[PDB]
């Protein structure tokens, strides 16, 4: 029988937001039926999507009613719409794409921090700056090691990157270390306190 276009598998279309890690392949599908066989067109942000719109362009497999984009990058973020039509009708569906860059490195600390410090008999601080994708665990150590402070539920990341030492004694002199670790590995920078 002759009929307008219709989706043949809404299950595979329910996931509207496609958030994926950079460098992966993305595939959008809009399985359709209809008689005569409906045509398919894909739009990017409501406008014709052309091969030159991204490095390496894209691929379309009419047999699977799909749009394929390989090695996605941040700039691919946007809306992708499939339009399907024949003489008896026209229907569309929209997907949203978001790309997230992942960094599989151990934590990285800013060079120069913490910095050496010199005092007398009454305050000082040691600062540290950490960067990491995988959640990092930060702690401050005094050199045989002694843990002065460590991140956790009771000592949030908000104030873990700065170590304060008031009314210093000659005993406080020594090497202080900011140590940061995640599942991949450990990093640490040290400074000296002169009293």
């Amino acid at each position: 029988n002759k009929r307008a276009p219709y989706w043949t598998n809404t299950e595979k279309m329910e996931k509207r937001l496609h958030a994926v890690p950079a460098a992966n392949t993305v595939k959008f599908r809009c399985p359709a039926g209809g008689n005569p066989m409906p045509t398919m067109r894909w739009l990017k942000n409501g406008k014709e999507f052309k091969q030159e719109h991204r490095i390496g362009g894209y691929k379309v497999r009419n047999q699977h009613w799909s749009l394929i984009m390989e090695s996605v990058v941040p700039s691919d973020k946007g809306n992708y719409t499939c339009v399907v039509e024949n003489e008896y009708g026209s229907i569309n569906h929209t997907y949203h794409l978001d790309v997230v860059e992942r960094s599989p490195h151990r934590p990285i600390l800013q060079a120069g921090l913490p910095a050496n410090a010199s005092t007398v008999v009454g305050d000082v601080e040691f600062v540290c700056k950490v960067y990491s994708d995988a959640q990092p665990h930060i702690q401050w150590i005094k050199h045989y090691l002694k843990v002065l402070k460590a991140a956790g539920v009771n000592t949030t990341d908000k104030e873990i990157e700065v170590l304060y030492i008031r009314n210093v004694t000659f005993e406080d002199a020594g090497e202080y270390t900011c140590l940061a670790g995640n599942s991949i590995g450990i990093s640490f920078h040290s400074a000296w306190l002169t009293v």
Binding site: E14, A22, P136, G181, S183
Partner: protein, 130 residues
């Protein structure tokens, strides 16, 4: 920035992990929901606790593999965080070392006892809380 709150997007179905004020745990697709803004915090190397900012509760996995959010931190609130080769994250219970935090294609959580390393239900992508 690791200290900023995040949304945890599940590859299975595309639901954002949600922690309700009364402690119920499920997934939803609406990026605007105020109960999907989470705060991760490392307790030790590679181990984190996940807290729902709005609900002010901590994600936890019970002995039967059920997920819920507790008012106070217990040993069922810590998970091994791992960046897989596929570039997605997984959260494995430090207590019940074989179960993973996961969501079903329906949007309801999945019993930790029914999870496995190769499943699509255990893969999450951390995203900014806008």
């Amino acid at each position: 920035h690791f200290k900023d709150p995040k949304r945890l997007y599940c590859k299975n179905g595309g639901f954002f992990l949600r922690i309700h004020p009364d402690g119920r745990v499920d997934g939803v697709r609406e990026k605007s929901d105020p109960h999907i803004k989470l705060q991760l915090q490392a307790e030790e190397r590679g181990v984190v606790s996940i807290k729902g900012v709005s609900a002010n509760r901590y994600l936890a996995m019970k002995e039967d593999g059920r997920l819920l959010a507790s008012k106070s931190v217990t040993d069922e609130c810590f998970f091994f965080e791992r960046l897989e080769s596929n570039n997605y994250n997984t959260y494995r219970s430090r207590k019940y070392t074989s179960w993973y935090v996961a969501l079903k294609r329906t949007g309801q959580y999945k019993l930790g006892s029914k999870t496995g390393p190769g499943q699509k239900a255990i893969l999450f992508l951390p995203m900014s809380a806008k």
